[PDB]
């Protein structure tokens, strides 16, 4: 889920 969570924070924060 990281690649979606995390691929959220590398794209949001």
């Given at each position: 889920?990281?690649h979606y969570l995390?691929?959220?924070?590398?794209?949001?924060?």
């Amino acid at each position: 889920l990281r690649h979606y969570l995390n691929l959220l924070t590398r794209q949001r924060y």
